[PDB]
Design a protein around this nucleic acid. Structure first.
Length: 64
DNA sequence: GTAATTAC
DNA sequence: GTAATTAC
């Protein structure tokens, strides 16, 4: 499942297998991901987030 | 400005 | 400490 989003004006697609930290900010979901040698950042509205990303969020919230 | 949390 | 992210 690819999460599609624009960040710093750049269009990106990221496989969920590369997504790491996921958290909730207001009505959007923010996350980090492995971006070949560096850790990237991205965010999408909760209403546009794919189910798998929402489940990663649920799991990260329980970890606390 | 705040909301969470980060890379820079 | 800034800029980034969607909404309020």
């Amino acid at each position: 499942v690819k999460v599609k989003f624009k960040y710093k004006g750049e269009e990106k697609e990221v496989d969920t297998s590369k997504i790491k930290k996921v958290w909730r900010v207001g009505k959007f979901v923010s996350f980090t991901y492995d971006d070949n040698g560096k850790t990237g950042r991205g965010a999408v509205s909760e209403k546009d987030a794919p189910k798998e990303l929402l489940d990663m969020l649920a799991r990260a919230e329980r970890e606390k």
